[PDB]
């Protein structure tokens, strides 16, 4: 069954899943719709999700952000946006003071208006993440209060859920259940300092979020379920269209990337296709996914298939230069001149020699040269970056020469010359710098240098150094 | 004393598995991108296979962005892009890493023959791979439910099991699963349980595997490697400069294959992280994981899965494993070869004017070779201002440089070498003599050592740079310091051809000639008589000579006398130094005799006089051979007058037997044998005809009528002296040549009737051609065979070196003359010469000790033993040496280029292998493959079986496949019964007593037997005698020593019988074992000492076992060796030759022995 070579263990593993019926596609897409809209509605039922959007638009008109980073546009321009957001704030400022039973009818509508806003994927992600992290915050206190009773103070969980469900905030459970004279009751006193003080955040969630610990779970739980449904369906679809992916990738074979690489990038393409597809447009999913997969394949190939990466326009530019070569090959009877395809092509046309160069792929350094022997290309590539020893002995010898010759001048001329150049010192120094260091400054030094150079100019000072210039 | 932190001179090396954190420790950055260079500005894209930040600056001491360009700013990390400005060489040093998303198996530990992950987990390979490919689920930490720990399930099975048991059961799949396995593994518990199980049940099949596995386990534990590390979390990346992108001519780029691979790995890995963040379906991410596994594997060692191909090129890309392994079988660069500076080479010429301590070198060559010396010496005297100007001077080739070159050349030796290097004499040192020309001049006497002809052979030259190398070359590699072959004490400086024809022509006597029967005062006026043309070079004459004998105590006796000799011998006597007797030059002076002259001279006068003597012999040889006017004409080859008659008679015989076949008196094959016999006999007749004729036919007159002596004919003198040619070839020149044999090997019954002096027609030549082609083919093949043999030999010996001075054991082998068949195929004197007596020997009467205890037996001792009748001498050998991990000089022998006892620290294993290997081109079941079989200790095809135990025997049971043989010892029991197939004709008497190791059948026998039944000395004796039987039959001289050291290396391993320290059946070093039992006989356990049994391992087998793993990586399969060492965390301490050669430090032998010693003792001590 397993022949190794993962091309197979893939080819066979995907072949199990049966192709979709034309109706089943609609079934799956419907399931997608169900899941998503579920999470959207769950988002609309969160007060903080609304108040956040408001706080964001207050930063949008305040020039701390742009309308593009908040909304992708509504179910529908900056004016229309301003008035739509005004509508949002309107429903919010009504629903807020009606909390005193009848409020619900508006809290429903408050969702609807908020559902008119199509959020940037990033923003939506921020929201959902905030909800789930908030659920982490709830779980912290739930497990703290649980472990501090059951694990530490020895109380059964069976009796622990009794006064829990429905409240888990007020002191009805904490201060009124410890006097019950149960085997686990009087044991609840030891940790009473730790449980009641950490309850601070527990009742705090009903302030920030605007929901009791009851609803907070229900809403985002429904959200989670929706997400699950969605991913389930979408995955199913992709797994159904893998065959299409392979069929596409078979065309791009020798472009310089491996087969399985091609089909994998294509798979990514198909995933994106399922993510962005809408069956409500009556467009066949096959021909729609085809383009996306093809796009992923091509775009990937151009990008990563080279030892030396080249820009997209450059690649296409090269191909354009191949096209001309084809016709003009037989047409001209031998081949078009190096400058022919030049005027044949739009751009400055001298770029041919340039473009024709950078295009070429580097020859494998391990390419065996003749004799079949261990002689391989790279073995013959000499180091030009090294320096010859014959020169290295001179570089060491010059340091003696300039040293003796500098021992020749006056100590201050030697100091000025060793300073004006980097001789046996860090960097070198400006003439003014040499000035400040000598206490004598400006033109003065510039003169001392000349005469110094003058003393080392004529022979018997020079005869040692003059032999150093070839 | 604070020990140290930073760089010291390191000892040993360690190898082991790599931790993710350790891998990160090497890594100075994570390569996050497949990109290499920008595509326009060739600068590296940051965080890529080629990068400035992670690895290093592009150009020396310069930042990438270009902000800090000054050599001052160095330890500075640039603010723009962090690059510490430092030498570009660091880009050849700093490594990197890649954090892999999904876990990955290291293909070296998956696919190594004893799969490491496999046997460590006690799990089969195919299972593990089936798990790695996500083909099935595997259990981990099953707990108590329904299932085993290592058990494997399927989709449906895993589902059902999970449905039954939610928790307290665990199963994973893929690389994560195998990692989880290895990590959950507790080795210690397995150790305890396995010890118990080992102890409980008694079955061979059970406790064998049991003990093997527990040993393996505890070894891996003691290593320090944790199993998890077999699965790679992190993947190290090799420095960019070791896989260069460097450009070429025409703006073209060339890069290694590691970039394609690494780039692939990075790509697939990043794409995997991407697919994770996209929440892809299972199948997709699985395919991606598998692909990642394949990519990583292909990177590490390619060819163990799919053999991935490089971009646009069919040829499979070279992976890191191939980078390490190299090519050409097993060659790791310090093996195959290495380019070397200060060297040269060229065609070679003669140069007889040279003394043997020197040689010619081309002017230009010496100039370019010594160039640095020439510069420094040019400016030392002050002829050149600075080194630059010096270069300008030697470049212009000013007249003043030649003298300076003559200065730097004078006492400075040079090394000369030939292409087929076999024995150490393949490279020799000489004193350079500046010569005008492009050709190298090489002293004639040395032409034998190199095996170099003048037909266009080239020699190479190397300059001994360091002072130590100069003195090494002069005191060791020097020509004059090796006058004797290391294989046998016979001189390798023996005169070759022209010279021996000269000395032969000189001393010889024709019946009559000028000055016949006269008398002369001394050799002076003898020569004066000859040159003036008054007397002939060869005539019988009495002359007075003064000969010396040093027979007094350290003192030369002088005596004079009238010797009956010839003019030529008298002239030649002038050369013969001092204490040599005149007798030596009074003979005909053949090549053998002219060699024994030099020999005796060396064993009498010493080195220097032998050297100058040899030189003079060469000079006079050439001169008088020149004067001789020896030539070769077409009439110099004389055919028998009776040839045609022999041909016709032998031709009558064929028609006799033919008529008999026509009438049916004889069969076809018998006829064939008959005719072939008569033709062979005919060839013998013509041969012994032309031989007698060409030899004695010279018939000349002295004062009487007639007389006849040995011929003065040229070709005869040439063949007889030994200058060149031989009876075999001369036979083919005059008489008919042989009978030829078709490629099948069926010998044609129509021999070649004609010869080379006559014409050969079409058929005869065509028939000869096959013989020629098979000749060249066979020889060219046996060269390679010899090479392979020497290779196996040096590999098996090598590190064996003289270490301790004397082990001091009475042990040794009994040395008797070979005495084969009829008389003495080799004497006792040669076998015992240069060796050392195990114990004192007697005369016929005793309390008179000729040779005391252990003493070197030189020529005088051996001749003193020859005076007396002593037929028996026990001699110390390297095989019996008590010294562990080496041989004591007192055990080895004196043999060397010098007559003195072997030096302390000389590496004997190498020279032994070389000595066995050099003649191997001269060897023809029998033959060279026979030698190869011997050293391999291969059991023959149809062997013989020796008696297991002494005592009366009888035939047991009946016929099924075997008829059992029941042995019956005198006292002890008789459980021993061997099953001998009865379809093989027996030998052993049903009613007779047979000693252990007797002949129970016929045919050759495996030396394993001879070792076990007949003893150690017995088996070493068998090997040495058989191999010497092969060589000596070809006329090859090899001392028993070298063979004996090879033998010692063969038996280095032995399998224990008893217990009390280590395991039962373990094969181990008899050095380790003997040292442990000698140490356990006292103190420790009172005596717990364990018995062993000596084992015989073939050379190629014994070569496998080497402490140093770096050594094993050289000549063995590299891929396996590195792993197999790395798991046990093996620590290579060097201590051997090969390893120290690889690592590039002084050899722990020879000159370096004073180093490694003064070190070795400093180590593991105060
Ligand atoms: Mg030759
Ligand atoms: Zn920078
Ligand atoms: Zn010894």
UniProtKB/Swiss-Prot annotation, chain A:
GO molecular function: DNA binding; sigma factor activity
Residue ranges that the Swiss-Prot or TrEMBL entry lists as coiled coil: none
The entry's DNA-binding region: 431-450
Region (Interaction with anti-sigma factors): 442-457
Region (Sigma-70 factor domain-3): 316-392
GO cellular component labels: cytosol; cytosolic DNA-directed RNA polymerase complex; sigma factor antagonist complex
Localization of this protein: Cytoplasm
Keywords assigned by UniProt, alphabetized: Cytoplasm, DNA-binding, Sigma factor, Transcription, Transcription regulation
Annotated stretches, region: Sigma-70 factor domain-2: 237-307
Disulfide cysteine pairs (residue numbers): none
GO BP, one annotated term: DNA-templated transcription initiation
Keyword Disulfide bond (UniProt): no
Effect on the protein upon substituting residue 454 to D/E: 2-fold reduction in activation of class II Crp-dependent promoters
Site (Interaction with anti-sigma factors): 420
Keyword DNA-binding (UniProt): yes
Residue ranges of the motif Interaction with polymerase core subunit RpoC: 261-264
Protein's job: Sigma factors are initiation factors that promote the attachment of RNA polymerase to specific initiation sites and are then released. This sigma factor is the primary sigma factor during exponential growth. Preferentially transcribes genes associated with fast growth, such as ribosomal operons, other protein-synthesis related genes, rRNA- and tRNA-encoding genes and prfB.
Record family assignment: Belongs to the sigma-70 factor family. RpoD/SigA subfamily.
Subunit structure: Interacts transiently with the RNA polymerase catalytic core formed by RpoA, RpoB, RpoC and RpoZ (2 alpha, 1 beta, 1 beta' and 1 omega subunit) to form the RNA polymerase holoenzyme that can initiate transcription. Identified in a complex containing RpoD, the RNA polymerase subunits RpoA, RpoB and RpoZ, CRP and DNA. Interacts with Rsd; this prevents interaction with the RNA polymerase catalytic core and with promoter DNA, and as a consequence, promotes transcription from promoters that require alternative sigma factors. (Microbial infection) Interacts with Escherichia phage lambda antitermination protein Q.
Record note on domains: Contains 4 domains, connected by flexible linkers. In the active conformation, the domains are in an extended conformation, each making extensive interactions with the RNA polymerase catalytic core.
Protein name: RNA polymerase sigma factor RpoD
Organism: Escherichia coli (strain K12)
Lineage: Bacteria, Pseudomonadati, Pseudomonadota, Gammaproteobacteria, Enterobacterales
Whole-protein residues included: 92 to 612 of 613
UniProtKB/Swiss-Prot annotation, chain B:
A Gene Ontology term for the protein's cellular component: DNA-directed RNA polymerase complex
Species the sequence originates in: Escherichia coli O139:H28 (strain E24377A / ETEC)
Protein name in UniProt: DNA-directed RNA polymerase subunit beta'
Subunit record text: The RNAP catalytic core consists of 2 alpha, 1 beta, 1 beta' and 1 omega subunit. When a sigma factor is associated with the core the holoenzyme is formed, which can initiate transcription.
Molecular functions per Gene Ontology: DNA binding; DNA-directed RNA polymerase activity; magnesium ion binding; zinc ion binding
Binding site for Zn(2+) 2: 807, 881, 888, 891
Name of the top EC class for this enzyme: transferase
NCBIfam families according to UniProt: rpoC_TIGR
Keywords: Acetylation, DNA-directed RNA polymerase, Magnesium, Metal-binding, Nucleotidyltransferase, Transcription, Transferase, Zinc
Binding-site positions, Mg(2+): 453, 455, 457
Membership in a protein family: Belongs to the RNA polymerase beta' chain family.
Described function: DNA-dependent RNA polymerase catalyzes the transcription of DNA into RNA using the four ribonucleoside triphosphates as substrates.
Classification via Pfam families: RNA_pol_Rpb1_1, RNA_pol_Rpb1_2, RNA_pol_Rpb1_3, RNA_pol_Rpb1_4, RNA_pol_Rpb1_5
Cofactor: Mg(2+); Zn(2+)
